[PDB]
């Protein structure tokens, strides 16, 4: 006997042992009489058009694939629920927090960032940790990473960062010059790069890592009062990492290591679960916060802003078909129910456009009609109609315009947004020089110990040594600008790596 993942078909057959196999039909429901030999003239003659059995199957085979995700293509998925355990209704009116003991179905996707569909699981990368809540006020998508922070803090750079992290356009190979020529030209990546190359760059499967919302968000309660917030869901199975040595072995011994581990855990009743916390910053604490509280390369320190528990995330169910239920999942940060609102984070504002945009391409204009994407615990009612591959009654014969004197849906005034006052020139403000070193300096000195600083510098050198000298030189100076000894240790190792 083997692990449960390997016995999938075995169990599938056992769970059907009594009933008879179904009839094999065409996509049109017509039974086929033989699907192992083609319609031909004589045993050694040519194929016929009449054989619509071959065409109908071959045609659909020819149309299996869709465009993989432009980032976070390698994914693992599982389903479960979220349960409220504490009371934060003084901050947010969101139904998903309405009372202790309330559950909501969730869907999760774990992913790497750079690799394509076929890439190994056990590499050095950040990890996608997206969560879809199916609430009654519509869906809520918390599309977070395993990091509170990110490498850049203005969306316009994002296509550039991702191009630098993916394949050279001519050679179609990973390029350390592209990787580091960007990172060293944009030292705002100092805070996140440090995180990446330390021990938690390679987590041991998806159950031994935290998730963060990273952005600052806005909560809104029943009085109309608003605060800013951070989301942290911390692993109840404990932070556990892989060594460089063991990550590289598994990278060829089991390219689907994290996928397997997740499925096997759920299958044997070993259910992973996370603890959702929030931080809270008042509007007037945001005015005096020493950094930009919406800077995505910054955290809120725990001494001044402690973690306030909210509930538990539990995954207890495996997908049944991976394509339908994991590959077609779409998470839109702009899916926010009343009570949860975006901050002015320059990076979050961009993701409000990008995700629904890319989802209309990747999946199809009516991608929200796909079951796993469908807000199936709310009533979708509005004045949008048509589009390719319409799948419900298309809202019936309801009046399709607004306003109207025929009682088609109405707006709900309690769901209006919180109103903030803003004043300033409409222009492009330079954010390349917000404090790029301070919170990193703290991380290097005060969070890491002696050994971890050693391994941090070795991991950086072990990937920066393939970049040209003028690129190495500038990166080292950036590291020097956090701590002299930081750059020194990397520069001592690069002197050796260069022979």
């Amino acid at each position: 006997n083997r692990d449960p993942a390997s016995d999938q078909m075995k169990h599938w057959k056992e769970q059907r042992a009594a009933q008879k196999p179904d009839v094999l039909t065409t996509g049109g429901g017509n039974p086929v009489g033989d699907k192992l030999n083609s319609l031909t003239v004589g045993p050694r003659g040519p194929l016929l058009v009449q054989d619509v059995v071959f065409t109908d199957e071959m045609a659909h085979f020819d149309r299996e694939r869709i465009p993989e995700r432009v980032v976070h293509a390698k994914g693992a998925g599982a389903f479960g629920y979220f349960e409220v355990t504490h009371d934060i209704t003084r901050y947010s009116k969101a139904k998903v927090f309405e009372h202790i003991g309330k559950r909501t179905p969730i869907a999760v996707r774990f992913s790497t960032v750079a690799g394509e569909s076929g890439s190994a699981d056990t590499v050095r990368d950040p990890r996608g940790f997206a969560v879809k809540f199916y609430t009654e006020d519509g869906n809520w998508d918390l599309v977070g990473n395993n990091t509170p922070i990110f490498f850049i803090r203005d969306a316009l750079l994002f296509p550039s960062f991702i191009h630098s992290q993916k394949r050279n356009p001519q050679t179609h190979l990973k390029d350390p010059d592209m990787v580091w020529d960007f990172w060293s030209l944009r030292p705002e990546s100092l805070h996140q790069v440090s995180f990446l190359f330390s021990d938690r760059g390679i987590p041991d499967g998806h159950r031994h890592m935290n998730g963060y919302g990273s952005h600052t968000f806005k909560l809104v309660n029943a009085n109309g009062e608003a605060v800013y917030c951070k989301f942290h869901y911390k692993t109840d199975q404990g932070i556990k990492n892989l060594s460089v040595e063991d990550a590289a072995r598994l990278a060829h011994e089991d390219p689907d290591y994290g996928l397997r581990d997740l499925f096997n855990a759920i299958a044997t009743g070993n259910y992973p679960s996370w603890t959702l916390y929030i931080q809270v910053m008042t509007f007037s604490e945001a005015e005096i916060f020493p950094f930009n509280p919406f800077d995505l390369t910054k955290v809120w320190p725990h001494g001044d802003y402690p973690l306030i528990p909210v509930g538990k995330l539990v995954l207890n169910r495996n997908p049944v078909n991976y394509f339908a239920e994991v590959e077609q999942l779409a998470f839109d940060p702009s899916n926010m129910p009343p009570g949860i609102e975006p901050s002015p984070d320059k990076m979050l504002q961009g993701r409000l456009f990008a995700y629904p945009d890319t989802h209309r391409h990747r999946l199809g204009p009516n991608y929200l009609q796909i079951p796993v994407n469908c807000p199936y615990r709310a009533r979708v009612a509005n004045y949008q109609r048509d589009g390719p591959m319409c799948m419900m009654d298309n809202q019936g014969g309801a009046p399709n315009y607004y306003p109207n004197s025929f009682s088609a849906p109405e707006h709900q005034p309690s769901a209006l947004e919180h109103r903030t006052h803003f004043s300033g020139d409409v222009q492009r403000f330079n954010s390349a020089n917000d404090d790029n070193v301070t919170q990193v300096r703290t991380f290097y000195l005060k969070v890491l110990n002696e050994e971890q600083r050693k391994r941090l510098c070795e991991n950086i050198a072990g990937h920066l040594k393939d970049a040209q000298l003028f690129i190495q030189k500038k990166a080292v100076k950036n590291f020097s600008d956090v701590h002299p000894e930081y750059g020194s240790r990397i520069q001592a190792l690069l002197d050796k790596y260069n022979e």
Copy 2:
């Protein structure tokens, strides 16, 4: 008080007066708070991307249209049933014919041929009369017209024909030189053209014209014995035509005359209906048939092959949403249930491929998962997976390959095709010189009376006068080949029209 169609909204409100109007949401279910004023910074300030409510709706407004049908774009639709009244189980084992009193749900779409989606309903043009039978053996599409014949008999001439009947590629105007340059060079059109320029060329709506499969099909019974057949469905409401003068007033008075007629008819209870007949020809009779029995420009005369009644087509239901239920209708002549099979009719062979092909472009790769197109009375199970906009469970975790030791669907041997023997060179055979005037001579002399012959030439002459003279000369010569009087009457009128 007005005709029922004009009161559509009025009635949608009355049928609802007992409820409260719904809540107006986004596509993602989120309630809208204001959908008449945009989110801007100051009363006379600019628009924000934070206004996702605008973008959600506008993005779907921008994607409302799909490609119109490349032919038969202007159409009318309704639903009803087919009911068996006579026994033809000796010829066909199809379940749709199984016993007397058997009902089957049907969908119908009426259409013109050349006009695009905005054209007028009351114009000279054939009429499409497509019927879809939702049988337990899968769907059956009988895609027929209002005429038993077509203008051509090889599918390689079809795109040409359509282009000649549509707009000038540079001026975008209907071009008489294109219509008649083609018809005069291809005299095999003389038959259908004579039908087209007769009174029936302009039916008084869709309820007063007959339907025809036109093609020769094949019927297989339970013993494996096969006959050839034609399908006729005649109007129970009686043939009734518009005159050129009335047709031209309605064309601007009410461009949607045949849509309004079909709708108000069903709404006011006047259910239209048709009587389905078949002709039968034995394989032997096919070998001695003077003409080619698979030549789409020939009828089987009624003296030699009388009409055998089958059942009743009835339309008793109006669509609730036009787009969802009529514009997305896709009829595939290749959808054939066991007991019905195609003949070698060259024109039917080409339609076996073309319709599914254009449905994957017009509607999409999985258009069969659109409700009206779904074989919702059959159990569709096979090894076809994925594709854009996949909407069921994608057949779940079932094994997706055949053969397989895990009891996925199995082929049904009794659904194999009838075996016919063919012999000959694989080679493009010339069919342009099959008899092109005999059956047209009979029609002119023995079906039409004098008045009708008189009008036939005036309708022809009124359109052919716009073609250059050398085209005129050639078309007249084709008509003289049918009957010298037929040609010389046309020519007498052209002599006048040419001043």
Copy 3:
């Protein structure tokens, strides 16, 4: 001999008489050996798959259509040039106005609003008068109508307005209840409805109407100083209109009357031309203007803001292929060169998004690479890469990220936008009760004479009579709010129309 449009094929053949016809190939460049008969097994046999000639052509026939414009679908196109004749460089620095005599290639598309591709040209409807200027600084699309104003003044009402002007979602029929339930509920439409229902509702083709940009636009000069402006391009052929009687005869005698008129004119050297004016309003005059100076339902009176000539628009070239040059034409109001900027106009703000959004759907992601859409007077260079159907080098092996130390394209600082100061609450402001009657009162009394006021009410009553009584009452009341005698005349004619 006939008119030039109908002799189009005759000339094509004449223009080629010297040379010999090309070889018939497949889409892959393979010569065919017969394209009139299909490859079959014997003369009466079935069709084969290895007839790739048939497949290659039919599959492309099957994909001829794309989506028609969601609005303004019926159109006619021509090309020519714009010539500067006066110096407005003190208001704008745009290269298209650089010096007197500077010409710029243009492309113009005329259209109606509500009809679909097959509808008639001579109907009551606004007209689209779009102009594309191919300047050195990129393309400038001036997407203008034949009115200075529009029915609404918020873009959130557009989908609704167009829904109410189009077909009933269940009967697919034009619905006078929708039309006037909307207009009566939204009286802001009083101004444009009064234009629509007067003589110029039906122009005598596209060579006898004026063009307008309707929206306020911003002009910026070389010093950085801004002003607000309107564009008027008046016809040098003279205003000329059709009567209700002649418009309706021509709606069935020549559905393509405006297209033929334009084509014939150009083909006979009678080139139509238009005179481009601007109005100018300073930022100070913008604060004291009696109404909102960005309200699309308002004009700037000539006495206070006179016309300032600019140049000529001239159409002297017919399209060679209508589909490739007129149906694939794409205008974007967001295509604006340095010198010309949008005003805060709530309607124009939304056209900034809607058009590129719809163009990616209707045509494709890279619709800007289609010839007629291409800024072929400019040099495109940036960091945008790939997409469906990429057709040039894709910009080669150039670095695809920014910033870079590898001499990829750079920004141009002198192309930065003008800076304006805005202040106020970010909220959705009500514009429903902007003065809806004052400028209409002036039109009714001071611009129309006794005869024209008569016909204006008659045209209104003819169409408003078909709507329910409660909608009539409301609409008349909106007309009495302009002038008692305005609502009176309409009510006396409706009294008659209701028997």
Copy 4:
């Protein structure tokens, strides 16, 4: 300094040192003023819709991906030429073989089979070796593999096989049970499976492997006489393989090993080349041939049918943009110039439909208009019009219908297909028990030595051990049927692997 691939960006800069950097625009050509900072209201304010620069780059970054290939997704590409070195004009009249010394431009793509876009190069799999000749008679796509044979010999089983070779639908894990449940039920895979688990299962890059057209094809000379042939192109660099122990290291040390090798060879002037041979079998030798001469699991032994050399394949140019020139590459076995024609091979026949079908889905309706797929050395001319993303003049104002009197393209009678006589019942013929072991017995005993048989059995058992026992026993039985020591060796190793 480093290898040439890593210095791609360095060199691109050097090759431009003399010029100035371009100007960064939008896609419409409009210059940008800053592309590092987003347009916001105040330094810490929300993003605006007015920021079209952001939308135009993000909207295109959201649509970068296209569906990877359904098979052979991981690939490597170059360009070069084919040169005729011998005369085979007595067999084929094709213009690519016209005279000794004639050159044709070619395009090659190497590829694995099962892995997706991100998998490793150095795995056990067959290798694609597609070749596209740009002929004056239109493209010729010789789409070969690195083996003369395949696992199956009917196309209906192909989706199944592939499904069995890829990922479990539920676990998204490679499944050994699936692999060998298929392979053991279908022992016609014995032949190719023995090829795959031998040394040549893992070639040392794409330059040290042969290429085979595999299928039997037809040649036709100028007299209309025809023969059958096999295409073998053998590596001029010599066969070279990797050991299991080196392939697994490289699989995590350089997943793109073969991609880097190809580029580095060409970039350093070391151009790889192949020698094209053919075998020939007369129509009369095909009749007596002991096995089915169109069976894709069978080779033509060299003693009886010796290689005849034809020409050289040389690759001497790297792609400049990988996506445009390698990812968008499209081969069609159906692209065949006069002189070359398909054999009745059941597999090949299916491939005549599949490839254009999937290319329309993957790339788009007009994929042949992409530069790298264009037949840019023939003149394409026909009656196919329009489609999404229409790019040339759409063939201008030419008559779009056939036949016509206006001198639009004409068919070429010399380009008709060779005529073969076929006879038999139209039915589905069972080919599952054509000889499945003979040629495999010959390979095991006569081609492999002692060591190689040893490594063959070790390779097979190492992967079959993970399959259930009832699958093991069957597969072993299929191996005993080739040779008792074959299935007994494998059984000895499995006995140990099962502890």
